[PDB]
Amino acid sequence: GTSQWLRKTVDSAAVILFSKTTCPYCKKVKDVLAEAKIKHATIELDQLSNGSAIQKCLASFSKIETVPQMFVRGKFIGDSQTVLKYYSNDELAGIVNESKYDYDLIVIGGGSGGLAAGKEAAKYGAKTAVLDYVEPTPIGTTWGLGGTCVNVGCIPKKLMHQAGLLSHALEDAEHFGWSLDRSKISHNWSTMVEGVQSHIGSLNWGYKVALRDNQVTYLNAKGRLISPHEVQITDKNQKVSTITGNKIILATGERPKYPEIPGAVEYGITSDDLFSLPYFPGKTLVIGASYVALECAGFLASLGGDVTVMVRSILLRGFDQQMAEKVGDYMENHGVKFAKLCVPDEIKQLKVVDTENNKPGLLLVKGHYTDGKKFEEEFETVIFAVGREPQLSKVLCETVGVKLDKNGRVVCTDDEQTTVSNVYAIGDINAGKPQLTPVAIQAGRYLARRLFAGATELTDYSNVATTVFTPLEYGACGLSEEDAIEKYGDKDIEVYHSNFKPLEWTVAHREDNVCYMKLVCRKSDNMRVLGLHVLGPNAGEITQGYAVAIKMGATKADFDRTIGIHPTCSETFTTLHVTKKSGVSPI
Amino acid sequence: GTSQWLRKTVDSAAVILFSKTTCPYCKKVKDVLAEAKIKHATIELDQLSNGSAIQKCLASFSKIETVPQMFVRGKFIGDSQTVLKYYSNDELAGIVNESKYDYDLIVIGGGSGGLAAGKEAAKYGAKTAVLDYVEPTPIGTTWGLGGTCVNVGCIPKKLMHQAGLLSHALEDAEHFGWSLDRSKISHNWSTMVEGVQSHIGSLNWGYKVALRDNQVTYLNAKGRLISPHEVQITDKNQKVSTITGNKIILATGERPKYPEIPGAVEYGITSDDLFSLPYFPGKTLVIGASYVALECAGFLASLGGDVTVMVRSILLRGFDQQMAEKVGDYMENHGVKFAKLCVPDEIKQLKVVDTENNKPGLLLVKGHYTDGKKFEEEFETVIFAVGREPQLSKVLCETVGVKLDKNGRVVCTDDEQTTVSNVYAIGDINAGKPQLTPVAIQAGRYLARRLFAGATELTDYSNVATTVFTPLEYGACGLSEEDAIEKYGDKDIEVYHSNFKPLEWTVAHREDNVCYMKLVCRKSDNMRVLGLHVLGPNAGEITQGYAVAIKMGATKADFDRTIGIHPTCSETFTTLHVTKKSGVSPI
Ligand SMILES: Cc1cc2nc3c(=O)[nH]c(=O)nc-3n(C[C@H](O)[C@H](O)[C@H](O)COP(=O)(O)OP(=O)(O)OC[C@H]3O[C@@H](n4cnc5c(N)ncnc54)[C@H](O)[C@@H]3O)c2cc1C
Ligand SMILES: Cc1cc2nc3c(=O)[nH]c(=O)nc-3n(C[C@H](O)[C@H](O)[C@H](O)COP(=O)(O)OP(=O)(O)OC[C@H]3O[C@@H](n4cnc5c(N)ncnc54)[C@H](O)[C@@H]3O)c2cc1C
Ligand SMILES: NC(=O)C1=CN([C@@H]2O[C@H](COP(=O)(O)OP(=O)(O)OC[C@H]3O[C@@H](n4cnc5c(N)ncnc54)[C@H](OP(=O)(O)O)[C@@H]3O)[C@@H](O)[C@H]2O)C=CC1
Numbered sequence A, B: 001g002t003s004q005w006l007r008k009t010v011d012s013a014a015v016i017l018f019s020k021t022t023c024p025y026c027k028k029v030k031d032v033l034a035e036a037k038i039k040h041a042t043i044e045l046d047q048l049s050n051g052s053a054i055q056k057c058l059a060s061f062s063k064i065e066t067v068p069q070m071f072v073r074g075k076f077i078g079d080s081q082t083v084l085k086y087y088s089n090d091e092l093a094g095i096v097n098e099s100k101y102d103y104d105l106i107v108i109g110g111g112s113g114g115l116a117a118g119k120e121a122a123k124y125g126a127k128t129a130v131l132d133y134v135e136p137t138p139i140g141t142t143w144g145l146g147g148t149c150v151n152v153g154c155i156p157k158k159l160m161h162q163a164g165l166l167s168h169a170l171e172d173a174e175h176f177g178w179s180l181d182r183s184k185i186s187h188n189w190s191t192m193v194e195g196v197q198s199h200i201g202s203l204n205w206g207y208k209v210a211l212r213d214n215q216v217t218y219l220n221a222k223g224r225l226i227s228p229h230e231v232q233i234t235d236k237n238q239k240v241s242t243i244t245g246n247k248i249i250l251a252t253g254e255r256p257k258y259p260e261i262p263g264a265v266e267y268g269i270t271s272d273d274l275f276s277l278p279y280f281p282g283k284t285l286v287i288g289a290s291y292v293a294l295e296c297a298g299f300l301a302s303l304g305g306d307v308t309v310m311v312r313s314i315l316l317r318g319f320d321q322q323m324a325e326k327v328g329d330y331m332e333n334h335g336v337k338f339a340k341l342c343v344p345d346e347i348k349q350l351k352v353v354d355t356e357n358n359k360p361g362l363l364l365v366k367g368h369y370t371d372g373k374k375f376e377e378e379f380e381t382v383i384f385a386v387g388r389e390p391q392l393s394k395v396l397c398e399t400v401g402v403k404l405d406k407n408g409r410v411v412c413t414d415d416e417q418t419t420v421s422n423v424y425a426i427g428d429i430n431a432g433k434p435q436l437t438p439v440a441i442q443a444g445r446y447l448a449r450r451l452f453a454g455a456t457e458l459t460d461y462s463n464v465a466t467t468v469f470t471p472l473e474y475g476a477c478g479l480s481e482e483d484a485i486e487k488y489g490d491k492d493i494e495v496y497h498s499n500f501k502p503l504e505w506t507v508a509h510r511e512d513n514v515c516y517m518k519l520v521c522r523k524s525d526n527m528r529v530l531g532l533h534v535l536g537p538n539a540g541e542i543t544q545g546y547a548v549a550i551k552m553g554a555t556k557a558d559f560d561r562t563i564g565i566h567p568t569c570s571e572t573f574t575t576l577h578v579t580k581k582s583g584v585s586p587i
């Protein structure tokens, strides 16, 4: 496959140097490229097991088999003497700038995936543009560069989770001997929001600076792909123009859904609004039951809010349902109210948001339970967390020839390629992929490296660990218990499980037999670990290291031979014994 | 090796049943043994790849090759009919009780290792005794069952660490929008100590109950081995008697050292005293610089104490010294004072501890720096943390024939065997082994399983992860950078490193470029991970999962293909790039 590899690399790379580490002629070219501040990929052939065969294949493109060999956009440009000739004649800059298109890469969307792809491509000398535009929410919320995670997702969510966790740190402090008067302590929502937004601000600015420093062109503009190589852009001044690019990356992400009921769009809010909400939500209804719903309900409650979650059917559809029940039971036991098997029919306004005193309005929510009981209750704030959807066009998109699925997501190969061959999709819009920030980031970086640096490594989307940052956190890697049973049959599945109590919870007088972990294992495959699950503090820190071991194909015996660190919650994974089949209590 | 395995198992096991899972005669024996509450090991031959050869070998001991086959203390006892015959004649109890010795196992020491070994042996029907006695410290401190960790180590240390961490949670709360008056918050040492000691109390009681429930005989008594099978015991009433045992496990642990200076023993304290100290230490000097010193100095400071650490030479000798410098620099930047290259010459009393008002005394510490400067300063409490030593006898011990090393530790094989063949040593007294609780626990359990359940698995003492619970925590697994360079040469070592900032530290306005991690890797061995190091919050939770991957032989590429969980500190391990050799800043 070394012939096809070289062909793909030469044809895709913007600026690439085939080299050897002990070659003084290769060094002379590197010195020239650095002095002229020409960024490029470098492949050192003496570092590759097939490097000699690569040298032979290079003659298909250059007629030579020596190093160095410099290419620009599919075209052999010269050996060392030739490159030096361009340098001394001041032709080199013109040569490396020469292109059929305005850009080697246009990235549409400047979130986790887009920024990662864009910055990484610039590193190998690709002329790169990143387009980002934030369509306002129905109530007008907008924000800066960085995408969902930075502005309206992981970052503000985890920070509000921390604010929530600190509530309980205050309770725990007393049992640890701290003398404070908790009846006189209160939380100020807007102060927290100011601190959160101040940090987000530094991230917005940070990414802009990063794009500058990597010589990526940033356009605060809405992009539309109108042909394989043509992107139509609309600026703030509403000016329309067209830019051309060799490769296009679609990284446009998703936006929250609203249910199709009266008053939803007019009076409700979503996560998009919540994280910069200038008033405190007050008595809140969250509609929905997956991780956005539960994470938001959870930090709101810990801040002292009166919180209700309206659950159509189950919690965290798609997650292990025993773990999901445990996540919910903990939240229920700690003040979060659940309206079970209940759907909303309408929102009616009773009071407008006080914009001067930064206070919430008041809403009437009518709904109904499965049994026929009507739901009718007042809330200061209604939050919809009922899924997220991509914002591209079944028709328009197909007219440029990019195929979307039923749900409006882009159908891609295992190297992120769409049905238009120079066009790729990464992050949340890529059909079938886990919708997480580091996945989008890994995909973008790996994709940029393949396109412009001749890398071969595909993103591995299997066994990607997650954490739901509910009040008690839930970390998982691999399969749910039910999905593993479905795949391999009950008789081939062994589950090791245990309750545990963090040492910190002992003096603090918190629950026995609530924190919980399990390993789902396949008997036939040497007790291969198929799924890991932990409900407990710092679950994400706990889970992460185990995701490496699982990707390497960890078995139970691997876990068993490993010695614990004491005292930690994580060490419980190293001494698990009780199986579910034995019926013995995990307590 | 299946002949030797069976010989060792039959000869060592107290009560063992060789069986098959589909045999109704084996089930009949199991029913009998359960009805008569006879605990035993069970080996299911149809579950072992060499089970058929085992069946053939069993005839060397029983003259039969069928299942079931029951053994007691080296002696074939019967097939199923025979066992049922003993049952119906009411002979079975007598048979299984028959022994040359009072016990199959005597465990001397009831700490982490001893309790683990003892409880695990009882599970397979071994008649087990555990001896524990706590020699009082010079000032009279004593405590209950469970050993160093439970009473004067990991447990109270981590709980005081948590109390310390909560101090900073209080500072962080305000930036997260919590309204509290910190100028009016103070810490009460004795309240904290009460909560800590109350939990320890429940552990003492818990272990006693566990020994009861597992039918282990517990003797609060000092044991001395006087011959291979004879243990002399001294009770509280000072009564001396002798008990005999087949196997002996030495699990007697260590005690803090004092330097040989005037006033040390009379006026100073150690970790043994600190965790139940009924007065607050006040202005404190810690003498020493390894993890006990730094962990204690650290939580004392976070509680608002005026703390000084007197450092003979370096911090954390034996740990990676770049990481050790970083641990210290953080503590120095946060109020802990270091008297560098300084040794104590004498302690003099200025004030006696106030025993009625639970207040500390006052001490004068004289010492000298390497340059000739005298050290002279007043402290309310002086803490020695200058190492720990075993408490067994170079002569007495050798007279029973158990060999000790230069440092007084027991010299053992890789299966914990001493130079006396029925005598084993586990935990801190085992020469050359990492001195950690879960190591002692794993060793005890694995040892009990080998002796009484026919297991083969040795404890793996390589790449055991640790965490130093300093104010900023330090987790490590595998080799220091300097030890890896020493082993494989500089040219074969690549180090990937990065600073990071916990997301929580952003709103809280804490340090950039202080949290830090690295992977020490071997170039020749496919960038094999030889050492992992992380300085940051929750370092132990971070480190633990990676210890499984490292035991499996993780390479850098394994880390690279693994996707991060966002947002966590741990995910930084999944995207490391910067190498030390490149000179690029980790910032
Ligand atoms: C509340 C919440 C909490 C979350 N928490 C976590 C978490 O803890 N951990 C985790 O891993 N993931 C979390 N996620 C998911 C994570 O945020 C996403 O998976 C990730 O941000 C998606 O990255 P992206 O690059 O695909 O899209 P985005 O980050 O959404 O970027 C797309 C960008 O392109 C813009 N755009 C759209 N159309 C155009 C156009 N045509 N022209 C120009 N620009 C356009 C969009 O406005 C946006 O700025 C969370 C998500 C939410 C909603
Ligand atoms: C301050 C401190 C903090 C620590 N923190 C951690 C940590 O965070 N994580 C970790 O893994 N490790 C930690 N350790 C180490 C851990 O405590 C030890 O490694 C472990 O307890 C040793 O177990 P052991 O069974 O060998 O000995 P021990 O637990 O010391 O048990 C020995 C017992 O036997 C008794 N004994 C002695 N002689 C006799 C006799 N002849 N007859 C009868 N009984 C006798 C002793 O009094 C004691 O009760 C810490 C240690 C200290 C001192
Ligand atoms: N890594 C992380 O910590 C986080 C990641 N995310 C990302 O965000 C994405 C989507 O977030 P989220 O908003 O939680 O959506 P999800 O796709 O995860 O789930 C939608 C939820 O809303 C409910 N729902 C859907 N329609 C209705 C309806 N019309 N009426 C009432 N309830 C309804 C569903 O319940 P039902 O089962 O009945 O259909 C389900 O509980 C996820 O896919 C994930 O990738 C979000 C939060 C945290």
Ligand SMILES: NC(=O)C1=CN([C@@H]2O[C@H](COP(=O)(O)OP(=O)(O)OC[C@H]3O[C@@H](n4cnc5c(N)ncnc54)[C@H](OP(=O)(O)O)[C@@H]3O)[C@@H](O)[C@H]2O)C=CC1
Pocket (backbone or CB within 6 Å): B259, B260, B287, B288, B289, B290, B291, B292, B293, B295, B312, B313, B314, B315, B316, B317, B343, B344, B385, B386, B387, B388, B434, B435, B436, B466, B467, B468, B469
């Ligand atoms: N896992 C964990 O979190 C923890 C485990 N432990 C266990 O406890 C054991 C011992 O604890 P520790 O007390 O820290 O002892 P250590 O053996 O770890 O180190 C002794 C320390 O005291 C110093 N020292 C020794 N003698 C003198 C002297 N006479 N004058 C001044 N300073 C001196 C040494 O400095 P120098 O370099 O100059 O010799 C060194 O810093 C460890 O081996 C470990 O297994 C302890 C705490 C935490």
Ligand SMILES: *SC[C@H](NC(=O)CC[C@@H](N)C(=O)O)C(=O)NCC(=O)O
Pocket (backbone or CB within 6 Å): A223, A224, A225, A226, A227, A252, A391, A392, A393, A396, A397, A398, A399, A400, A402
């Ligand atoms: S996928 C084809 C293309 N879509 C986009 O470039 C993004 C559209 C999305 N931002 C939106 O609709 O908001 C497209 O719509 N083609 C336009 C055309 O004229 O062919």
Ligand SMILES: *SC[C@H](NC(=O)CC[C@@H](N)C(=O)O)C(=O)NCC(=O)O
Pocket (backbone or CB within 6 Å): B223, B224, B225, B226, B227, B252, B391, B392, B393, B396, B397, B398, B399, B400, B402
């Ligand atoms: S190791 C030989 C034996 N030691 C012990 O059983 C423990 C001694 C220790 N607890 C202590 O000294 O405090 C021993 O000392 N032999 C005595 C003898 O008379 O041979």
Ligand SMILES: N[C@@H](CCC(=O)N[C@@H](CS)C(=O)NCC(=O)O)C(=O)O
Pocket (backbone or CB within 6 Å): A020, A022, A023, A024, A025, A065, A066, A067, A068, A079, A080, A081, A082
């Ligand atoms: N004319 C060439 C010189 C090529 C040359 O002498 N390079 C040597 C390496 S220093 C080479 O490619 N031959 C050895 C090999 O097979 O790699 C240039 O200017 O680049």
Ligand SMILES: N[C@@H](CCC(=O)N[C@@H](CS)C(=O)NCC(=O)O)C(=O)O
Pocket (backbone or CB within 6 Å): B020, B022, B023, B024, B025, B065, B066, B067, B068, B079, B080, B081, B082
């Ligand atoms: N007399 C024996 C009966 C032994 C017997 O019939 N056992 C069968 C299993 S059910 C056996 O060991 N033979 C089959 C084999 O080779 O495992 C007893 O009472 O234990």
Ligand SMILES: [Ca+2]
Pocket (backbone or CB within 6 Å): A559, A560, A561, A562, A563, A564, A574, A575, B442
């Ligand atoms: Ca283990």
Ligand SMILES: [Ca+2]
Pocket (backbone or CB within 6 Å): A442, B559, B560, B561, B562, B563, B564, B574, B575
């Ligand atoms: Ca990665």
